[PDB]
């Protein structure tokens, strides 16, 4: 229910997920300029080039 929601190498920040959500994700991919990490709540569907991870603990998406 509590996840990390910061991006890339930004200082750490957290959020409270919606009631009934139990997960936390971590998307990583590279564009023309560099590497982007997207942390949030849930477990989404990603296109076939992204390194997606999902964890059902707490603050475990860093």
């Amino acid at each position: 229910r509590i996840c990390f929601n910061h991006q890339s190498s930004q200082p750490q920040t957290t959020k409270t997920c919606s009631p009934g959500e139990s997960s936390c994700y971590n998307k990583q991919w590279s564009d023309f300029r560099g590497t982007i990490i997207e942390r949030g709540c849930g477990c989404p569907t990603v296109k076939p080039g992204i390194k997606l991870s999902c964890c059902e603990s707490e603050v475990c998406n860093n």
């Binding site: 190498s9 560099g34 982007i36």
Partner: protein, 109 residues
């Protein structure tokens, strides 16, 4: 003006790459975007900010094939793993377009 404030308003023909879902043609709705940004500078040297929450369609010429349902502009901040405190900015305008399905109903269906 004498304070140095500059207002420049040039014309442009924009040709944007818009994905076209055709599942429901000729009764289809499209979401077309226009991503704008500074090419060689980052948000610490040249910052951009939208003028209004949504495009200006006060002098918009009605189409004949499309109806404007909604339009908005969103500004994004992007950070990369390499550079921890350098943001890359872009304003993205979207236009939700509904097609008028009379020509294709009378000519094909």
């Amino acid at each position: 003006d004498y304070t140095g404030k500059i207002m420049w308003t040039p014309p442009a023909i924009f040709k944007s790459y818009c994905e076209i879902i055709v599942t429901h043609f000729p009764f289809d709705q499209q979401n077309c975007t226009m991503k704008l940004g500074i090419w060689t500078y980052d948000g610490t040297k040249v910052s951009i900010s939208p003028e209004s929450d949504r495009p200006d369609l006060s002098t918009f010429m009605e189409s004949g094939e499309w109806v404007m349902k909604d339009y908005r502009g969103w500004k994004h901040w992007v950070y990369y793993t390499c550079c921890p405190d350098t943001p890359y900015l872009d304003i993205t305008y979207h236009f939700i377009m509904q097609r008028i399905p009379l020509y294709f109903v009378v000519n094909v269906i």
